[model samples]
Target: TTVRMMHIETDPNVLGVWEEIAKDFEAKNPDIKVNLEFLENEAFKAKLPTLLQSQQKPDLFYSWGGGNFQVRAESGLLEDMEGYSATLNQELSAAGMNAFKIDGKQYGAPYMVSQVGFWYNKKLFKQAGIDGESIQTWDEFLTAIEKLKAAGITPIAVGGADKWPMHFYWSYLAMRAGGQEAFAAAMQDQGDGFAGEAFVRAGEELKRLAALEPFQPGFMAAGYGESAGLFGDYKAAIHLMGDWDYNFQAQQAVDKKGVVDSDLGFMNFPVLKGGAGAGSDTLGGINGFAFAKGAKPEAAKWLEFFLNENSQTKLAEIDQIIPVAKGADKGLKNPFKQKISQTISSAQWHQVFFDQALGADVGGVVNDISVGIVNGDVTPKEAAEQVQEAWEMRLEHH
Candidate 1:
């Protein structure tokens, strides 16, 4: 028997570690062989629909539990693993595991979770006479940025070219402003839908941050890797990104040293004053592996072994991931990662990325308007209207 697993990770070191895990699994189960395959991120997204429907589909493939997973589940292209839900629920974070379910039926097993926040350089903050820990609200955050700028520091680094990085600001703001109710209302097309006041306010808030010109010069054209390198090299005071940026910055840095652990700081995304959302609401990714329809039962067995406590602990020890498995975080040595883990564990609501939560068509428009709002090319009302129009169009198609 063979189990085929496909993923979109480009990091060679991470892949090497996965390969080692596969070999260990193979050694334990002599009758089963595991083959791991890789695809570039964009290419994987482009080809996934076709792949999921093909006879050549892998036994299991990477999944970001969101609109994509919902689409696949509705299309009957994924295996329903309700039978495994009991064991899965016990082994993983309940919120993380629930992300992969549709209509109360499990279709995938979450292996990791991440949260988006402001990662800063402690030395840079000290030099600018700004305290990262003191920033608990949107107003305080803006004031800190101003203080950093006043001290001749580039306050933020953003990958505007990648577009998604900037979208984080809009998404987090939306989550802060509206919470789960607003998102549910928007999705169900109730009371102004995506054009609702919450989205407009989110755009307005993002514009306010942009108006300060907090990002580095040339930021609009910078890619994700470049922006990460800037933060890693201490060329900027802060980078608002997912927890993965902790390792990514080092890999993207010129000398690869990045920000040493001692000088790094993590701050949660700030709260909006009098907003509907709780301060504990979070926005981030829930990553997992979903079995292809008609995959052998052995695939599930392999996934269980692959995501077991030992394997999860090994991955966590490498400092490359925040594993979802219970007790696996004990292996995490990075303080920033541990803090992020604690934050996620305690979060009231963990929203998936908006672009992903909204599905491809609507997500693209969300991305567009996010950039447009920040670039001053669109008003907050205009941005909300565009998203609504896009959402309506998607409804018409379905």
Candidate 2:
């Protein structure tokens, strides 16, 4: 039987590695052919629901483990891989494997782990008379932003149109204000649910940052690619993004060189004073592959091989991912990525993207409110209520 795999990665370098792995897998299992399919990121999300219900569904596809994975698992549209849990745990990070488990059943296998943080241009910081290393607290970060603005430089670049980029601010702030308990409470509809004080405070904090107008002009209209390109061109001082942006920004830049290695810097998200969450908490994605309900058993076998030590090492060597395979990070050469990998490994709490963690319907509301709050279209309290209402509606439907 043929094993069809699909993903959204566009980088030729990364795709080349996958192709190499596929060829080797095919060579070993002569009767089983592997076919790879590609799709653009946004399009993949938009088309997946329909695709998954169709005969054309790929045997396995990329997934961000969280509420969405749970939704799919509950719909009886995914393969239950709990039978392989013991074997998978041997090669992957415990946390990464746990992300793909829902109701104590494994439905996917994580391939990479990531953390969201500020990626800054050191030259720009020096020009602004600000030291990125010294800005570790929320107040310190705001002060640096003011300094950059006073120096006639753009303080930040954000993909406002894409919405999720701005959502990071609100989501991280919420994590800081309330921690895991607050999110768990909200999920269970306890004590005000998403309208709780923690969420409101997060909105207020994001509003405060937005009040400074830190982002570049037309930021409200800029797509993610444009925003990334702006930062890559050094037109902005900082970008809040995942570690993957290190390579993505380079590809998006006009010169295709992005930020030079020596000029790049990374800083964790600033901690709010007296917040419930630990400063060591993080926000990012745990990326992986999920098998369709009717996929050939061979699909899972290919995944195991693809995620094994050998293939993972090749991926790490190219800095293509923060590999989930145990010891694969040893092959990483980029210092910034190495730091991100270490930070994620040590994070007291690693929250997945809000849109993914909250599930689709409610997650869409989170995205909307994030953009609305930053644009001053919604008050903090109003945003919280909006999310609560949406969550309630989702509950009713379910």
Candidate 3:
């Protein structure tokens, strides 16, 4: 039998590896041929929902766990991998298993999963008279930024063109100000709300961070690639991004431009003084593969293969990826990668990204509220209320 698998991914090296895997898989299973389809991240997001709604469902697709996975699985667009989950757990490392399960049921397997946190330039910190190791409390963090500003360095680099970049601030703060369980309960409308004191504080902190003058002048006007380039080029002192950014920047900055790796360093969000969540509760999860309805048997095989240690190791080796595989070599390509891997391994717990865990509809509303907060249109209190209201509304519709 011939298998056609559609995948939406942004990492170029990982795509090539996937192709290689397909060829090898077919070589082993001479009775089957695999066709892998590729799409840009944006195009894939736009087209996936419609395809799922219609009859054009792919055998397997990239998915996020939590609410993002919940909605799709509930919609009956994906296959339930729970039956094969135990076998998968035995084959994958513990972290790898985390990406495959939503709640208790396993849905899809992930080849690469990495954590999200803050990345700062050590040279910039030294120039600004800031000590990266001393920023454990939120107030201390702000003080460090103030010191940076005093030295004329932007404390943060942000690009408005990429909406997700903006999201990182809101989500991280929310977790720090509000505990993981509290945030999760609020996300589902099962108890409490995001509009409470903790979330409001989170929003206020985000606003303060935004008001700092560290971003590039006219950052709102910068395109996504350009804004990301600013961080990669060391135009700013700090960048709050994911492990994926670390890998991408490391590759392009060195492989393409021949720059030295010492130019890059990263730190997780400074610990919040007397805060509810620890720095360890940072964001981390896979973006590919949610259940799609009526997945073919061969499609299932491909997904299983994708997360197997062999495939995962291939992706990590080529991309310098921080594989979710337990005890996987922290094969981080840059300083930033090493920092994030250390944070994840040492952390007490983990949280899925705030936006993705919020689900599609509520996720949109939260993004809008986030923009309003960033743009000075709403107070953090109002933004929290709006997020709480939006989640409640989505639950009602469901």
Candidate 4:
């Protein structure tokens, strides 16, 4: 019997390790064979839904695990892994587990958690008289934006043309203003849903930041790659991004070194004073694997073997992942990666990136309305209504 695992990983180093894990598993169970298939990311996303409906679907495949997963679960595209892999519920982080479950049913297993934060160049922060380390409250952060403006330094760099990048601000602030309770309510259609007053506050805060003209010049047209390049080239002081930025910016840099590790620093999103969210309520994604319908028990066994502490530690050593395996973060050699691991570990509520959390139709509206908020062409209440409208129509159709 053969089990096929579909994935988007292109890095040879990471793939080599995955291959080794499969080899080890096959060696122990001589009758079972494992196959690792590679697919380019965009094409994979386009190809997956169709494949899931056809007979050609892989037994297990990559998943971002949010509203997207929820839709798939409702559509009957995935196999319930609860019974076959329930032991992992005890082994993996609770934050990781939460993303892959729906209505108390586990559909998958988490492999890594990628957190969102401020990845700043300390040299630029020093020039702006900003202490990236001591930033705690939102007011303090807004003050730093002013301080940064006075120094004539761009306070942030974002991929405005890409849209989703800008939504991080609106979404993070919404989480801060509303916290877990408000967000849970929003999802379940309680207390104003996406059009809530807390959501309006998010837009107000974003409007305040945009008024300072914090981002790099022509940022509205800047793509994600160009924005990372701007941050890497030291043209910007702060980049609100993920753990992957360490390597992403390095590739986008003119020198290809990016900001050296010593010059680079990461901070959690600032907390809102008197808001429902705490400093530990994080914003990020728990990347993982979900089984397609009719997936074999052998596929579940392979998933279990690939995500255990020992196998995941190998990924941590190379700084490729913030391991979801309990205690696997100890092997993380990079300080920033370790911090992300710790942040997710401590998080009482780890919200997945909003675009992914909202599903595509609603997620697209989130990105558009986010840019609309920054553009100042839309009022806060109107922005909230647009999101709520999309969510309502989506519900009606469902």
RMSD (CA, angstroms), candidate 3: 3.0
Candidate 4 regions with alpha-carbon error over 4 angstroms: 10-13, 22-47, 86-91, 94-98, 102-106, 150-152
- C-alpha lDDT (0 to 100) for residue 387 of candidate 1: 93
Question: TM-score for all predictions?
Answer: 0.92, 0.96, 0.88, 0.88
Clashing pairs in 4: none
Candidate achieving the largest lDDT: 2
Task: Score each candidate by Cα lDDT.
Answer: 0.86, 0.88, 0.69, 0.86
Model 3 whole-model lDDT (C-alpha atoms): 0.69
Best by TM-score: 2
lDDT of 2 by residue, 90-183 (tens): 8898878888887887788999988899999999999999989998788899999999999999999999988889999899999989988998
lDDT, residue 95, model 1: 71
Candidate 1: regions farther than 4 A off: 81-90, 93-95, 103-105
- Kindly report which residue stretches of model 2 are placed more than 4 angstroms away from their true locations once superposed: 82-89
Q: What range of 10 consecutive residues in model 4 has the weakest lDDT sum?
A: 40-49
Worst 10 residues of 2 by lDDT: 80-89
